[model samples]
Target: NGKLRQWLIDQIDSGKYPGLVWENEEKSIFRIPWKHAGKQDYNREEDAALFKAWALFKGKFREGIDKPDPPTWKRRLRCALNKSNDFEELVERSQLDISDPYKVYRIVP
Candidate 1:
């Protein structure tokens, strides 16, 4: 369903979903900017919610900081989700089909 696709895309672009993280060099500071939103939107039974959280954190972190194409952001999302113990449950529940990870930022269309 394109509705699902579009909704996922909207969450990525707007940063209104879950799993946004900002950390420090000392490894002592960890922040989840969307922690509240994650609590609201992260449905263990909703595959789209999991996918949106992944895409949202991936896109937001890449643009402002990393600016590189690697699996770092993917792992970062997993780590962020782990803070709430959502990663394992979400992975068990979701079968997300992500082909082009970078397409999360292709918001122009």
Candidate 2:
């Protein structure tokens, strides 16, 4: 199915997605400017919704204000899913493939 394939690709592509890295007196870390870190296929409404969610999230978390822990793959997933209501539901509705160990573990809030 195209949808399933796309979803899988979205996950993979997003997982490898790169952001920015900076080093200073304190430490170093990779960060995706809140503006550039997300799935590229989002439609206008989705984009708007995502921007709104990101704005709120960024305001609260201050993503780029300081260095983060590390460049984890799941961070991109969190950013993308955090913005999209539908994608979040899709993840919740689907049964993940257990064969892949990475898929078996997730960051739970």
Candidate 3:
């Protein structure tokens, strides 16, 4: 369990992902936030590991790696960013919108 957790933490900190990266057909890269990068369900174990890594990254250290919960602010920010027009429209539909802060509706904090 410790090894698995450490491995997961390392993967997130490295910011390296395997396989072909999918291009969001609708939104520009700048529109989507970085934290939402690997939150999808490609494989359960892989996803869990990635999520664990994200938690560690957000916490700014691995000392609390055993904590199963994600940082609230980071998770919320990621969700909002993922749902932003740039990410949602592109992933859900090949649609694009051009506007100020095109993808994000608003940012808190």
Question: Number of the top candidate by lDDT?
Answer: 3
**Alpha-carbon lDDT, every model:** 0.36, 0.33, 0.37
lDDT (Cα, tens digit) per residue for candidate 1, span 27-91: 22222222122344433433234433455543543446645422444455555445532122223
- Per-model TM-score, in order, reads 0.26, 0.22, 0.32
Clashing pairs in 1: none
* Model 3, span 1-109: residue lDDT tens: 2243344334434556442122344312223222332444234443334445555555533654554444443464456346544333334332323221122222222
Model 2 regions more than 4 Å off: 1-71, 101-109
Off by over 4 Å in 1: 1-67, 85-88, 96-109
Q: Give the distance in Å from residue 27's predicted Cα in candidate 2 to where it truly belongs.
A: 43
TM-score of 3: 0.32
Better of 2 and 3 by lDDT: 3
